[PDB]
Every structure is written in C-alpha cells, then in structure tokens.
Amino acid sequence: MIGLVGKKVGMTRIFTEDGVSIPVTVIEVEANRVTQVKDLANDGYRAIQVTTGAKKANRVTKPEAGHFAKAGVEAGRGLWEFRLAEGEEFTVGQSISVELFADVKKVDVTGTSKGKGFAGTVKRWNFRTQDATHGNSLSHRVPGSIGQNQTPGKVFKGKKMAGQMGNERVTVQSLDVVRVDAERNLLLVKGAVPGATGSDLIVKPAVKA
Amino acid sequence: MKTFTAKPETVKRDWYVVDATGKTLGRLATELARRLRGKHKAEYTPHVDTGDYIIVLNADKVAVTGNKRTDKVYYHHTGHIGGIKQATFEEMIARRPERVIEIAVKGMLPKGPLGRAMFRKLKVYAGNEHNHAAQQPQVLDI
Amino acid sequence: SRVAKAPVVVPAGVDVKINGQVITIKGKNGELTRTLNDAVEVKHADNTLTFGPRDGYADGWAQAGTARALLNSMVIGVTEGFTKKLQLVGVGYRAAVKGNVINLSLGFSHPVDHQLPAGITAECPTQTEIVLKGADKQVIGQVAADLRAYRRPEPYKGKGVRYADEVVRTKEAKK
Amino acid sequence: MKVRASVKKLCRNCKIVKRDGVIRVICSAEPKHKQRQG
RNA sequence: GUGAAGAGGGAAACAACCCAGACCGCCAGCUAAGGUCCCAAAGUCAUGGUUAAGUGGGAAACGAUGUGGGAAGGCCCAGAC
RNA sequence: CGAUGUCGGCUCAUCACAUCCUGGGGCUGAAGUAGGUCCCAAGGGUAUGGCUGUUCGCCAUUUAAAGUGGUACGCGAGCUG
RNA sequence: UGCUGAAAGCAUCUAAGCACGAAACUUGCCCCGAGAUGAGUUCUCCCUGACCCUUUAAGGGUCCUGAAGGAACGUUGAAGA
Ligand SMILES: [Mg+2]
Ligand SMILES: [Mg+2]
Ligand SMILES: [Mg+2]
Ligand SMILES: [Mg+2]
Ligand SMILES: [Mg+2]
Ligand SMILES: [Mg+2]
Ligand SMILES: [Mg+2]
Ligand SMILES: [Mg+2]
Ligand SMILES: [Mg+2]
Ligand SMILES: [Mg+2]
Ligand SMILES: [Mg+2]
Ligand SMILES: [Mg+2]
Ligand SMILES: [Mg+2]
Ligand SMILES: [Mg+2]
Ligand SMILES: [Mg+2]
Ligand SMILES: [Mg+2]
Ligand SMILES: [Mg+2]
Ligand SMILES: [Mg+2]
Ligand SMILES: [Mg+2]
Ligand SMILES: [Mg+2]
Ligand SMILES: [Mg+2]
Ligand SMILES: [Mg+2]
Numbered sequence: 052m053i054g055l056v057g058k059k060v061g062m063t064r065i066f067t068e069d070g071v072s073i074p075v076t077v078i079e080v081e082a083n084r085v086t087q088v089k090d091l092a093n094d095g096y097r098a099i100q101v102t103t104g105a106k107k108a109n110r111v112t113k114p115e116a117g118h119f120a121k122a123g124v125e126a127g128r129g130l131w132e133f134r135l136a137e138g139e140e141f142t143v144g145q146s147i148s149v150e151l152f153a154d155v156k157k158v159d160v161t162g163t164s165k166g167k168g169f170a171g172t173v174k175r176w177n178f179r180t181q182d183a184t185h186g187n188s189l190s191h192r193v194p195g196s197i198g199q200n201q202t203p204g205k206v207f208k209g210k211k212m213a214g215q216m217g218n219e220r221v222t223v224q225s226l227d228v229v230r231v232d233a234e235r236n237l238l239l240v241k242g243a244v245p246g247a248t249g250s251d252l253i254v255k256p257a258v259k260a
Numbered sequence: 261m262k263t264f265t266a267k268p269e270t271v272k273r274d275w276y277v278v279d280a281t282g283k284t285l286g287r288l289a290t291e292l293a294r295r296l297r298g299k300h301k302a303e304y305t306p307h308v309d310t311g312d313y314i315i316v317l318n319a320d321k322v323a324v325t326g327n328k329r330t331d332k333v334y335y336h337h338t339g340h341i342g343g344i345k346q347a348t349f350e351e352m353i354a355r356r357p358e359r360v361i362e363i364a365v366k367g368m369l370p371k372g373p374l375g376r377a378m379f380r381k382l383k384v385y386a387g388n389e390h391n392h393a394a395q396q397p398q399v400l401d402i
Numbered sequence: 403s404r405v406a407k408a409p410v411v412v413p414a415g416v417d418v419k420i421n422g423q424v425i426t427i428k429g430k431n432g433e434l435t436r437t438l439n440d441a442v443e444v445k446h447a448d449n450t451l452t453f454g455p456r457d458g459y460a461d462g463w464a465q466a467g468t469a470r471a472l473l474n475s476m477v478i479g480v481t482e483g484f485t486k487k488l489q490l491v492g493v494g495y496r497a498a499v500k501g502n503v504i505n506l507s508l509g510f511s512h513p514v515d516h517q518l519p520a521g522i523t524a525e526c527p528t529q530t531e532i533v534l535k536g537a538d539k540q541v542i543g544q545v546a547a548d549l550r551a552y553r554r555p556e557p558y559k560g561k562g563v564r565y566a567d568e569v570v571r572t573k574e575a576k577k
Numbered sequence: 578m579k580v581r582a583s584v585k586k587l588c589r590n591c592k593i594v595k596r597d598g599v600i601r602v603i604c605s606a607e608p609k610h611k612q613r614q615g
Numbered sequence: 616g617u618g619a620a621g622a623g624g625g626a627a628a629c630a631a632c633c634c635a636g637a638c639c640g641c642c643a644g645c646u647a648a649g650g651u652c653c654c655a656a657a658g659u660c661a662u663g664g665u666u667a668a669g670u671g672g673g674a675a676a677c678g679a680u681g682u683g684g685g686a687a688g689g690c691c692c693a694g695a696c
Numbered sequence: 697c698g699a700u701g702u703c704g705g706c707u708c709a710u711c712a713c714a715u716c717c718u719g720g721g722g723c724u725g726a727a728g729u730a731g732g733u734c735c736c737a738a739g740g741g742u743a744u745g746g747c748u749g750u751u752c753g754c755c756a757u758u759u760a761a762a763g764u765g766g767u768a769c770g771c772g773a774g775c776u777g
Numbered sequence: 778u779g780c781u782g783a784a785a786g787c788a789u790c791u792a793a794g795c796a797c798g799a800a801a802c803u804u805g806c807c808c809c810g811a812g813a814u815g816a817g818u819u820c821u822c823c824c825u826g827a828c829c830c831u832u833u834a835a836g837g838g839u840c841c842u843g844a845a846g847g848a849a850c851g852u853u854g855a856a857g858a
C-alpha cells in the first residue's frame with residue numbers, strides 16, 4: 052500500500068479518559084495530488100508520482116510547470132513517488148486524502164533528521180571519553196586508537212570517526228496511529244518522528260505489521 | 261622493410277552471434293577471447309584491438325562438467341574487512357547469469373586498457389534474443 | 403542384474419505408453435508416469451517389459467534393475483494399490499479425517515493437521531489407527547514417515563506414532 | 578553417533594555403507610554401534 | 616658444483632636450483648631445460664589405458680564391499696550363495 | 697645497534713573457531729527436570745568490585761554466558777607512567 | 778532424519794530419482810547508490826538567422842541573436858568549519 056506526504060507540525064499530548072497521556076506527533080496531510088502514473092510498459096515498474104502544497108508562480112520553472120500542466124493539476128512544493136502494489140491503481144489528476152489511513156493502525160514515518168553538523172565520536176558513535184584527570188595530556192575526547200601495528204598498514208573501511216551527523220533520511224517503524232482528522236487534514240502518531248518542525252514527512256503503512 | 265602493424269582507423273571488425281546452449285564454459289570462452297583478441301587474423305597486432313564483436317546468447321544454459329555446478333565458487337571482496345563474499349555457479353546462474361561468461365572471458369583476456377577494450381565488445385545475453393539486428397551479425401559455430 | 407534379467411509381465415487392464423524414456427502406465431487405480439535413466443533400454447514384448455543396459459553407460463544393470471523394480475511397483479500400484487497402516491500408542495493420542503486433512507491430536511499445545519497429497523486417500527477405523535491407500539509407493543511411504551515424524555515412538559514406553567508392523571525396541575530406565 | 582578415523586563392524590548386525598563419500602557403520606541391533614568416519 | 620666475482624632462458628615472483636658461460640651489430644635459422652586451451656610463443660596432435668577425487672593442485676598411523684589389472688584357491692546344475 | 701620505545705592499565709578495535717551463551721542434531725549407564733559426550737554452526741552477545749604495579753590469581757556478589765587465541769605477547773607521532 | 782530403490786535376487790537415505798532440515802548463506806527490514814566510463818530509464822522545457830574562408834572538414838571566421846535555465850549579489854535558515 053502507498054503512503055502520503057505530510058509535514059511535521061509539532062508534538063503534543065492526548066489525555067485519554069483513563070488518565071494516560073499519549074505523546075503524539077501532529078502530521079498535517081494536505082491533499083496529495085497525482086502528477087504522473089508510471090507503469091511497466093514505459094517505466095519498468097508500477098508507481099505514482101504525487102505533489103503537495105503550493106508554490107510561487109514566478110518560481111515554478113517552465114519544465115516543472117509543464118510537468119504539472121500535463122497532469123492538469125496545481126503546482127506543489129515537490130514531487131515524491133510511491134511504488135504500487137498489485138491490484139492498486141490511481142488516475143493522474145486524482146487527489147488522495149488522509150482517509151487512506153482511516154483504518155490503518157501502524158505507520159512508518161520517513162523524514163530528514165536534524166543537522167548536528169560536524170560531530171565527534173563521543174556524540175556520534177557513543178565513544179567513551181578518556182580520563183579527565185590522572186595525567187591525561189590533551190586527550191580527553193579523542194577517539195584513541197584506530198588500528199594495529201604494521202599487520203594491516205591501514206585503517207579499515209567503515210572505521211568510526213568524526214564527521215557529518217544527521218541531516219539524513221531515517222525511518223521510524225511501527226508508530227501507532229492515534230487519530231485521523233480528515234476535516235482539518237491531520238494525522239496524530241504516537242511518539243517522536245524524525246525531522247524538525249515544518250519539514251516534509253513520508254507516512255507509509257507499516258510493512259512489518 | 262619494417263614489419264606490418266595494424267592501424268586502429270583502417271582496421272575492420274565484424275559481428276558474430278554465438279549460441280551458448282550446452283557448450284562447455286571454458287572451451288567456449290577461450291575461443292571468444294581468441295576472437296576478441298584478434299588472434300585468428302593475419303593482421304594481428306598485440307597493441308591493437310583487431311578482434312570482432314561477439315554476441316553470446318542463452319548464457320544461462322551454459323554447461324560445466326563434474327560437480328562444478330554445485331561446487332564451483334566465485335569469491336569476491338567488497339573492500340570492507342569482513343567483506344569476503346561467495347557465490348556458487350548455480351547461484352550466479354539464478355542471480356545474474358551473464359557474469360559467468362563475463363568472468364571467464366575477463367580472466368582469459370589481457371590485463372590493461374586494451375584488454376578492457378576487448379571486453380567491451382563482448383555482449384552477453386541470458387535469453388535467446390538481442391537488440392543488435394541493426395549490425396547484421398553473422399552466425400558463428402564454436 | 404539378477405533383478406533386471408527377470409522381465410516384468412504387464413497384466414490385463416494395464417495400459418502402457420512408451421515415449422522415449424518416459425513411460426505412462428494406466429489402470430483401474432490411476433495413471434503413473436516415470437522418465438527412466440538414459441542408460442536403460444526398455445521394450446514391451448507383448449506381455450512383458452524388459453530392461454537392458456543401454457551401451458556406453460557405467461551403471462547399466464544397476465539402472466536397469468532400479469527401473470525394473472520401479473515399474474513393477476507402478477504396475478502393482480495401478481492394479482491393486484498400496485496400503486500402509488499406522489497405529490498410535492499413547493494416552494489421549496488420536497486421529498480424525500476430513501477428506502485429505504488428517505487431524506492429529508498428539509499431546510501438543512496445538513492441533514496437528516496434515517494435508518494429504520493428491521493420489522493418497524486415508525481412513526481412520528479407530529481413533530488410534532490410520533490406514534492410508536494410494537498408487538505411488540514412494541508417496542505412501544513418505545506420508546507415513548511424515549506422520550510418524552510428529553511423534554517418533556519413545557523407547558521407554560513405545561509411546562508415539564508407529565508403523566502397524568514395525569517392532570519397537572524398548573528400554574528400562576535404570577537408577 | 579561415534580565419529581572416528583577407524584570405523585569397524587562391532588557386531589553381526591553392523592553394515593558398512595558409503596553414503597555421500599563418507600564411510601558409515603549402521604547397526605539394526607545396537608544404536609551405539611552407528612559410526613561415521615571423520 | 617654454482618654464487619661471491621656471472622648476465623641470459625626456466626622453476627609465478629625466487630643470489631646458491633635446472634639448462635647454459637654475454638666482444639659488437641642484424642625485423643635471419645636450429646635447439647637446451649622447460650613447455651604447446653586463453654592471459655602468453657607453440658598440438659584443443661595421434662593411438663591405448665586409468666581416475667570422478669577438481670585427485671591433480673599440501674600431510675601420517677590407521678580405517679573402508681571405491682575402482683582397474685593379474686595369479687591361484689573352495690562350493691557348485693548330484694543344485695552352490 | 698648512523699635507534700624497530702619492550703610490562704600492565706585506558707581508548708578504539710578487528711579476525712580465527714579448537715563455541716562460553718543462544719541455535720540445530722546423534723548416543724546415553726537419556727523416566728521427566730537437569731545432565732554427560734560428540735557433530736554442525738562464528739549471526740549477535742559475552743560482568744561489576746576488594747587486594748595487588750600487575751597479566752594472572754584468590755575472594756564477594758551477579759549473569760543466558762562471564763569463550764579460547766591471533767593481531768610488533770594489537771594499539772605511547774592515541775593517553776598514562 | 779528419511780522415502781522408494783538397485784548395484785550385490787536380500788539388505789541398503791544414493792548410485793538414478795524424491796522429501797525434510799539451524800541464530801549460519803541469499804532474500805525479506807533500514808541507508809548510500811548510474812564516475813554502474815557497462816556513465817541507464819521516464820517526464821517536461823528551450824533554441825527552426827544571414828554570410829565569408831581555403832588546407833573542404835566532426836574545419837575556421839564575421840555580423841545579428843542570447844533562449845530554457847543557471848550563476849553571482851542581497852535578506853537568510855531548527856542547513857552549515
Ligand atoms: Mg542544524
Ligand atoms: Mg573512562
Ligand atoms: Mg606534557
Ligand atoms: Mg586536560
Ligand atoms: Mg600491503
Ligand atoms: Mg603481463
Ligand atoms: Mg644467473
Ligand atoms: Mg622469469
Ligand atoms: Mg636463472
Ligand atoms: Mg618459483
Ligand atoms: Mg625450431
Ligand atoms: Mg623437450
Ligand atoms: Mg598462443
Ligand atoms: Mg639495534
Ligand atoms: Mg636510520
Ligand atoms: Mg547433545
Ligand atoms: Mg566445527
Ligand atoms: Mg562472535
Ligand atoms: Mg542472516
Ligand atoms: Mg577482576
Ligand atoms: Mg577502600
Ligand atoms: Mg586482530
């Protein structure tokens with residue numbers, strides 16, 4: 052089954068009658084509108100290409116606006132693409148609402164994580180700091196040793212070192228969907244999804260069930 | 261005088277279609293590498309690619325002798341430290357059957373830029389068909 | 403060899419179709435089909451099938467004798483059928499039949515259901531007894547081995563699924 | 578299963594069979610007699 | 616005996632091993648060890664066998680109805696196994 | 697020997713399998729539970745403290761288990777001393 | 778672990794044929810990923826002028842033209858050395 056493209060509005064809590072506070076992540080899901088249907092005869096696979104949101108008319112380019120004009124649909128802020136299962140099809144100018152998740156129970160939310168910048172191995176790879184006293188010379192947060200002596204004159208591939216942390220695609224699996232509010236285009240999932248506030252989210256039904 | 265050398269502009273190359281059904285792998289591959297090298301031509305020159313383009317079809321129906329179908333092992337290494345990998349013959353046939361012919365010929369070709377240019381002329385296909393009817397290829401029986 | 407030299411006489415009501423190395427034998431209990439080894443030369447002498455080593459092959463008489471005892475069993479399967487009996491030893495152990503799904507109750511926490519293959523028909527006279535009939539000998543023996551495999555018989559009390567004819571060598575728990 | 582370099586018949590009911598390149602002793606009488614050359 | 620103080624060809628590479636002792640030049644021929652499917656020069660040569668283990672292409676005591684060949688023996692159409 | 701920093705700890709590790717746990721089996725002098733032994737299996741996992749410079753070891757209390765080794769007895773142009 | 782089954786009139790899981798079988802293996806889950814030079818696919822957008830040259834060819838030059846788009850600059854960011 053396909054997913055929908057939303058946006059992280061923020062987090063809040065749903066007080067049940069029983070006295071339980073459910074930490075939820077509000078995901079507004081506007082009308083995803085299809086722009087292209089891909090198939091086996093032309094594209095080798097079955098998928099749809101959707102768009103959501105709006106865009107400035109002076110900023111949407113002539114190739115992109117011609118691509119939306121062929122589908123006959125308003126330009127959105129992006130283009131995403133969802134693989135189709137069998138027995139599942141959609142038309143081109145079709146709009147897809149959040150009622151698709153009306154009877155799902157768990158979703159997988161894919162987002163782009165927050166940018167931690169250039170991070171050290173303590174933060175990134177959870178390395179232990181060395182001793183803050185007892186003689187330590189300028190070596191409190193360094194990674195320590197990185198190899199062995201002459202046997203493989205070389206550091207191995209994938210050695211855990213410092214570098215860019217975050218700002219990348221991650222997927223949180225098996226999030227309990229709490230509420231599907233079709234009237235104001237919302238989706239409340241239990242827990243914390245990746246991404247900052249106002250960033251794009253991809254909500255798909257859970258594959259692991 | 262001086263010994264003739266072939267020239268890459270004046271050299272002519274031809275197209276051949278080989279059906280690989282039932283043929284032995286290495287005994288096919290050394291004739292393929294002979295005709296990609298150009299050692300069947302009197303204008304052979306070691307530093308010049310004078311061989312012919314060869315299309316090999318029915319690559320999944322190539323035959324090996326013995327128990328090599330279940331016992332021949334294709335090792336490779338991913339670069340990473342545990343990264344030794346391993347696939348048998350019938351696993352390579354199920355997964356990507358073109359690699360078996362490609363590996364045997366690449367092992368029988370010269371090593372270098374010219375041997376890689378000779379390998380670029382080998383065009384293998386698992387099926388019984390090809391998109392290269394435009395080059396009017398002749399059949400070759402090996 | 404000594405098995406392969408003795409020809410197999412096809413009876414009446416047994417239809418034989420020769421096709422290369424493939425032999426289809428029909429009858430009043432079903433049809434059976436088997437491709438022989440290429441080392442085997444088979445021919446029908448109007449009342450018997452004969453089985454000879456085709457030349458240029460190492461296991462000549464070995465493959466011929468295997469193809470002999472096979473088509474003998476295929477003939478008996480298509481004119482009489484085979485019947486394998488199983489019995490259940492143990493308290494609370496039982497069996498029930500639903501068409502081609504034996505519903506075993508072998509002292510587990512879950513019900514045991516076994517789907518029967520195509521040409522195999524089963525029947526429980528008693529709850530602690532299974533009688534299965536069919537054409538192919540390899541299939542009735544495989545199904546009986548599979549049904550035995552759920553409760554292989556314990557050597558201390560003989561408890562579990564056994565063949566109705568096998569002997570169960572017991573053992574006393576010493577101290 | 579005894580696994581040895583030297584496998585032998587231990588009783589009258591032992592039978593030496595070569596299954597898949599491995600010498601194996603099987604005994605219908607005693608299950609202790611079943612062996613496997615390795 | 617070679618190296619040291621000796622190059623060349625082969626043994627993958629490999630001072631001391633195998634063949635063989637470099638005056639110079641040649642886009643000439645024959646050969647040595649070693650080789651002749653391709654990398655990589657030359658037999659997918661011929662005839663007759665053996666092996667099924669990739670043995671070849673690493674190893675012992677010991678173990679085994681693997682298989683090929685040879686010579687002999689004791690039961691046996693009074694009927695063997 | 698016109699210099700290859702040699703114990704132990706710390707920090708990063710990585711490979712082998714002669715497997716400690718977990719997984720699959722065979723035999724048991726295997727009633728069950730719990731075990732003994734051998735075979736397959738290296739995917740992941742695999743204590744904290746007292747003493748002592750210690751590795752080790754003993755001891756205390758845990759844990760499914762507290763593996764055996766290689767790596768310049770891994771790692772001082774990474775720390776300590 | 779078996780089934781059928783000879784070789785070896787029996788027997789036999791194997792030689793022909795068939796079935797089951799583990800945290801290992803390949804998948805399934807997540808991420809990068811066409812510099813995958815074997816450089817792939819789909820969709821959309823843009824440009825539809827005149828002439829000279831000699832060594833005439835994937836040739837060189839003049840004038841007109843300057844598209845889609847991009848870059849630069851600026852305001853900046855839960856992006857960032
Ligand atoms: Mg940031
Ligand atoms: Mg610390
Ligand atoms: Mg200092
Ligand atoms: Mg400090
Ligand atoms: Mg190196
Ligand atoms: Mg070379
Ligand atoms: Mg010399
Ligand atoms: Mg040399
Ligand atoms: Mg020499
Ligand atoms: Mg050598
Ligand atoms: Mg000569
Ligand atoms: Mg010679
Ligand atoms: Mg040659
Ligand atoms: Mg020194
Ligand atoms: Mg020095
Ligand atoms: Mg055990
Ligand atoms: Mg082992
Ligand atoms: Mg481990
Ligand atoms: Mg795995
Ligand atoms: Mg301690
Ligand atoms: Mg104290
Ligand atoms: Mg190591």
Ligand SMILES: [Mg+2]
Nearest residue numbers: 765766767769
């Ligand atoms: Mg050591």
Ligand SMILES: [Mg+2]
Nearest residue numbers: 200768769770
């Ligand atoms: Mg050390």
Ligand SMILES: [Mg+2]
Nearest residue numbers: 199200771772
């Ligand atoms: Mg160092």
Ligand SMILES: [Mg+2]
Nearest residue numbers: 703704772776
């Ligand atoms: Mg140190």
Ligand SMILES: [Mg+2]
Nearest residue numbers: 200201772773
């Ligand atoms: Mg250094």
Ligand SMILES: [Mg+2]
Nearest residue numbers: 781782789790
């Ligand atoms: Mg059998």
Ligand SMILES: [Mg+2]
Nearest residue numbers: 471782783788
């Ligand atoms: Mg039999």
Ligand SMILES: [Mg+2]
Nearest residue numbers: 796797798799
């Ligand atoms: Mg299976």
Ligand SMILES: [Mg+2]
Nearest residue numbers: 718719740800
């Ligand atoms: Mg687990």
Ligand SMILES: [Zn+2]
Nearest residue numbers: 588591604610
């Ligand atoms: Zn025995």
